[PDB]
Design a protein around this nucleic acid. Structure first.
Lengths: 159, 245, 58, 102
RNA sequence: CACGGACCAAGGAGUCUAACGUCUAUGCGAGUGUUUGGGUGUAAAACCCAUACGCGUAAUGAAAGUGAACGUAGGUUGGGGCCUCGCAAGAGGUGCACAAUCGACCGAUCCUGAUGUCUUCGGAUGGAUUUGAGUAAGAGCAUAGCUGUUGGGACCCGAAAG
RNA sequence: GUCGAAUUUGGGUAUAGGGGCGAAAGACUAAUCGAACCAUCUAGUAGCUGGUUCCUGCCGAAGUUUCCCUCAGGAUAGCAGAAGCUCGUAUCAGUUUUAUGAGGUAAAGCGAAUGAUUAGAGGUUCCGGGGUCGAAAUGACCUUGACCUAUUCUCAAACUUUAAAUAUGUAAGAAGUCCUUGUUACUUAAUUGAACGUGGACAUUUGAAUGAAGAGCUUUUAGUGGGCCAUUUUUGGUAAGCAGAACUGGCGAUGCGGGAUGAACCGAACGUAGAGUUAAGGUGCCGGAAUACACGCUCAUCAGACACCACAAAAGGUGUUAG
RNA sequence: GUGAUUUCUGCCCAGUGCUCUGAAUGUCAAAGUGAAGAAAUUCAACCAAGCGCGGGUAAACGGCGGGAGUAACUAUGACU
RNA sequence: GAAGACAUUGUCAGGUGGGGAGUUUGGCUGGGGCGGCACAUCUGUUAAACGAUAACGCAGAUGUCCUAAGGGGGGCUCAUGGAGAACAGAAAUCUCCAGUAGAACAAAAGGGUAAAAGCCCCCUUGAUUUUGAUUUUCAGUGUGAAUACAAACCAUGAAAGUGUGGCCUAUCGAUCCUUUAGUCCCUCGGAAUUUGAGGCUAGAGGUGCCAGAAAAGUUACCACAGGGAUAACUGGCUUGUGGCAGUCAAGCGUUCAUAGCGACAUUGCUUUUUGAUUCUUCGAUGUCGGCUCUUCCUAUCAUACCGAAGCAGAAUUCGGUAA
RNA sequence: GGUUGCGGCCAUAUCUACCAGAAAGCACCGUUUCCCGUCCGAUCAACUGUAGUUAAGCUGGUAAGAGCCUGACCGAGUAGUGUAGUGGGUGACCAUACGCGAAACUCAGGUGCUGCAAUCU
């Protein structure tokens, strides 16, 4: 009949890679996880212990518990009409940091730097980002540059 | 028409014997095709009478039980013959040639006052049991079997090698030199510290020193039959020896 | 009499009538599941700083 | 399967509370021992007219009982049970396995 | 081209009772409920009353049993209001209800065992990723109504049988 | 048909309902027989069929999950109504940008790993996996075969370097940043770290767009648990108005205008009226509206006429028209 | 149970039934007897019928196949 | 007269007993049966690049085995190929070079791993004790399984370490009842002691229809509630099949593709055959054939008029208008 | 800049072929009493840096090399796809409108980069 095991349908998701077989590089273990940090889940096929279920491949949560081999990760999973709050225990092979959080933390240092310098200047802070704007009018110089007339091409087979 | 042959055993010994025996008498001539299944095989016979010829052949050589059913095809109007496509479902008795078998208490008293703890010898038309300790034979026709079916305690897959030491014949013989005491030991316990089992067997006349025999070793098994649980555990022998080589 | 065994039709439309809404995650999350060596220390550190503010600052 | 006759495991007998040497034997069910409260209620309800008043089980399917080992400390003689997985063959002691032979 | 309906009058189908659930109205409030019964009566009404009983105010344990403040009845985070300041905007103090969290208290389990001791009884004190329908300045009882649940012939009519 | 006998018949008299009687049909026993008639327990039980009595107002479903001797039914979760409570710009969204992850489908690849399938000829201790007899094991017989023994061709839902579109996870700051030093039995060689803090600094551009007939939480119960259709992707099947899935939209509950007619198609969703403009569709007449305007094509001794849609193909023509 | 007469009614006692002037220690309840125990009780021995074994039975129910060989071949409704 | 402490009668016990009574005789399902288990589960695929996703879809597996095939450390390297060696060859043992894993890892398939998770030694019991939190199927209940810690005691290793069973994904079970272990603790309600029985905490005996009933048939003598949710007669959708028509022209017709037969490819029609479906009717459409009687279609057997022939006449064949 | 121990990113670092390498460091190379491991002091142990050498290891250079990694108005706005029509077609499918957008190839270039500590005419 049917089949709903713990690692069903994970033929291509838990493969290792092409030309990345072998033990993991040691800078994976050396990273530091503090409570609250944002993490991404990407299940290493090599280390079977502490390995996430196939749903949580690619999800993103928060560090709340830190133990010897593993980190506590909370992921919001939807079922029915509702968001549950589910807790995981993943070893440090599978977990990895998120650059989208890390680039925000540098942008806070840029924002705090602008405000103090603007205050000594004394006007016009302008801190918010803007989306892309429609471009301004300008003159295009045809000097040394004459327009080249084109035409549609007729049909040829060349088969 | 179809004769559906089945047998509920994982290792079919009786059914392999039928395929050898179906060839010699040349009983299958009227087959259209042959399919296979999980626990047996299917035969396809073009006419109804040719299907009946096979079950009368299976009645003679192998213990069977069968029943028939049909379904409509055409629903003819003028003639009336409505073209029923038949099906015959034949079931082989799940007791093999060398099953160690524990009989029910009412059944074992009815035939020959035999002990409940027996073997099998004559897999042919009616199933025949043999008491290996004190020799005695008892039959079991399928009409006695299918009214109250049971199973086999062990099978032909838990057999253990044994090494015979000497053959001590008491003397009484039915037809194959019965009740000869055999001192025997496993192949396992021989090179290691000395363990000796001493037990009667029917395999007395054909057996000599230094010959390997197969057999059931009861004392290391946790069986789970309630028929076995209604026995007297200080009367059940430790070793039952089945066959030579 | 066969029946339609399973369908997910009209399921997502039933979900969004009330609102998927987030669990809204209050301050001071529960320490159930945290390493009990850490919880045993965290008991005393609060009892220290409450005693430290009480006597020194009033 | 095979288990050795002697196994060193944890004891909790108020004097040891630590690993000591244990002797291993095999669990035996035990006699029915009537005058029990189930049997006294059963014998009363069966007597009379009406016949069988309790279910009589027929459809048995399993083939292996689980193995229970009772473990006896040699020092303080505090017994303890311990179970295994299902198996068709169970013996204890003899036939230490040897990998390389003819 | 599925079933009932020729026409007309009258009859005709979610009712009552016991014990209850949420909600709402009213009295009373750590209490509450006169009406089994007695007193009286313009008499199956009204009016009046003893003492018990009922749930409630302490849980927990399977039981023998024990049985709720280290403290402004605890700290933290918000919190309606009010107070102070301001011309306002705002700032600060206090923060009931409720929501989140770490504690303390009592019972069960588990562990440590002080003075003593009829030498085996007694369990002081301090514990623990455990546990309970607990305490932490009471909120219940009685009546009535909508609805809902169960047993009753239970929305009305209907078997073949025993 | 039979008609002098196992004949026909009156009155008497016996046998009573799991009992009678039967030259045997399950016949007969007061128009009742594979278990009579009457009364009672009795208004016997039903997941089954039919019925269910005034009006207006507001809101408004589901045929799906898990479990059941369960598949015509229940229980639970769903959607729904009512009662409100706390507060009132709180912070949220069937959506986009910005940043950043995850996937192996289309398409590519075989002169990159892997690659079937169609048929199958030999090799008597290069194995035996079985079956049968066996007073045995120098043991026989019967049979799938061991073994492909030089090759010859194929691509891919169950093959992979590379890898889209659509859909999907998280971030875009007050519960935040920075500075200073407090707590402890945790941790460190170490007042090193860890978490939570006191005090001080940073405000309306407080950290992208856009929107918000308020946001958040609780209680309580009705109905439902037979579905269906189409665009598109698909699976078994010769094919279907066939069986089975995926995403959204609708019918069921829904009128109105258009397709002559039609539950789904196109337009558009309804308090009662007046006026103006329109949607899809139409303008010879039935039929409200141009026998308009403009360039061409076709003559049919079965013309042709409007998506869904009520059907027609391969193959021929010195019929005509343009290349 | 067959269904006048004239004629015949073959072979099979094993399966299932029926019966036995047959052999006895396998099965075996209540009461009784024996031991252990403070007693409730626990264990053992003997243990009727029938069952089981052995004999009869088809005008009782009923059933009535196949195989290999035998002076070269052939192999029989024959000898084996 | 005959019999006689036996028979009979009275209670208890074993055997016999369809003569009689009571009841039962699964579920899924292209009608129901037969078979199968899609009934509890596991891998690949269907599956349309997160998750979810159906069919009696496809290729398959499980109810086991293991004191090592579990746990810790150390040393080493595999399949196969090349060249060498008395007996020695296709294959024994020995030797070197090449060797990205083409071998192995208890079993299905898919992952994974090379100074190892493989092979060979060494010591060993962490396959133990206390009990909670979390993940998977999910109602976020169970059962099974799995991860990460804490409080103890150990194993191995020089050590950092790892170890709560098999490298990972399957390998299994409630209440009641019997039984064991632990506390040697609690109760036997007039008060005691010893037996006995009853409790708390934790394992075992099992329900495979696997969230867990104790269960054989027939009805052609049949009964009731219902169902076109579901068959048997017609209708409708479909045309594999059957019928029938075109294209190519193989074989032929001595020597001649098409006077004429026409195998075989390929394009079609129709409902005169049969299947596939189950839309309509089971509170009934009177379900085969013949006799009688009218009308309609043309794919033309005969009649009328023509066309082609391998048509001299005669006799025929092919074909056109024609019902 | 060369070396050595220890690393990080893990083929631009690999593989194949030849050719060089002062100084110092590595590396082969001498032995067997002790420790220990072996059938064998070959590996591992131990002792001497003494007797000997850059021939190997290793490092560097070379190659219209194999591989590998970056770029491209290279292939190519092609393949494929989201949304829309009372668009075409008998069907198969194909155009157009608003959007997104590959791969194989071909060509051009490249052949390790660096952290900590130590050591050398």
């Amino acid at each position: 009949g049917k089949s709903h095991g713990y690692r069903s349908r994970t033929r291509y998701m838990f493969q290792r890679d092409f030309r990345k077989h072998g033990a993991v590089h040691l800078s994976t273990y050396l990273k530091v996880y503090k409570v609250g940090d944002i993490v991404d889940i990407k299940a290493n096929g090599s280390i079977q212990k502490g390995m996430p279920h196939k749903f949580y491949q690619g999800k993103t949560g928060v560090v709340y518990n830190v133990t010897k081999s593993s980190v506590g990760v909370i992921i919001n999973k939807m079922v029915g009409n509702r968001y549950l709050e589910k807790r995981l225990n993943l070893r440090v092979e599978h977990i990895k940091h998120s650059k989208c959080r890390q680039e925000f933390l540098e942008r806070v240092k840029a924002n705090a730097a602008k405000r103090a310098e603007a205050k000594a200047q004394g006007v016009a802070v302008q801190l918010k980002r803007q989306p892309a704007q429609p471009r301004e009018s300008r003159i295009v110089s045809t000097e040394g540059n004459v327009p080249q007339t084109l035409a549609p091409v007729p049909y040829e087979t060349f088969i | 028409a179809t004769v559906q042959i089945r047998q509920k055993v994982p290792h079919k010994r009786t059914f392999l014997f039928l395929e050898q025996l179906i060839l010699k008498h040349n009983a299958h001539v009227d087959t259209i095709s042959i399919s296979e299944a999980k626990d047996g095989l299917d035969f396809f016979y073009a006419q109804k009478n040719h299907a009946v010829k096979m079950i009368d052949f299976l009645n003679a050589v192998v213990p069977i039980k069968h029943k028939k059913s049909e379904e409509l095809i055409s629903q003819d109007t003028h003639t009336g013959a409505s073209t029923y496509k038949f099906s015959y479902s034949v079931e082989i008795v799940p007791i093999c040639k060398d099953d160690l078998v524990v009989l029910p208490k009412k059944l074992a008293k009815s035939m020959g006052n035999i002990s409940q703890f027996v073997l099998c010898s004559k897999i042919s038309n009616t199933v025949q049991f043999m008491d290996p300790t004190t020799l005695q034979t008892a039959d079991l026709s399928p009409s006695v079997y299918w009214r109250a079916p049971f199973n086999a305690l062990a099978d032909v897959t838990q057999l253990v090698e044994f090494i015979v030491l000497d053959v001590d014949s008491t003397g009484i013989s039915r037809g194959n030199r019965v009740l000869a005491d055999i001192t025997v030991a496993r192949t396992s316990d021989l090179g290691v510290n000395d363990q000796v089992y001493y037990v009667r067997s029917h395999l007395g006349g054909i057996c000599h020193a230094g010959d390997s025999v197969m057999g059931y070793f009861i004392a290391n098994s946790n069986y789970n039959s309630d028929l076995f649980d209604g026995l007297n555990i200080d009367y059940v022998p430790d070793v039952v020896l089945v066959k030579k080589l | 009499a066969k029946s339609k065994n399973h369908t997910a039709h009209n399921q997502t439309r039933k979900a969004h009538r009330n609102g998927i809404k987030k669990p809204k995650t209050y301050k001071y999350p529960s320490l159930k599941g945290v390493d009990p060596k850490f919880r045993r220390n965290h008991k005393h550190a609060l009892h220290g700083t409450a005693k430290a503010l009480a006597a020194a600052k009033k | 399967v095979n288990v050795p006759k002697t196994r060193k495991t944890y004891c909790k007998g108020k004097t040891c509370r630590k690993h000591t040497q244990h002797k291993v034997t095999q669990y035996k069910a035990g006699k029915a021992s009537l005058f029990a409260q189930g049997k006294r209620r059963y014998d009363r309800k069966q007597s009379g007219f009406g016949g069988q008043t309790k279910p009589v089980f027929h459809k048995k399917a399993k083939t292996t009982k689980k193995v229970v080992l009772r473990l006896e400390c040699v020092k303080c003689k505090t017994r303890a049970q311990l179970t295994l997985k299902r198996c068709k063959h169970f013996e204890l002691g003899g036939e230490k396995k040897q990998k390389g032979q003819a």
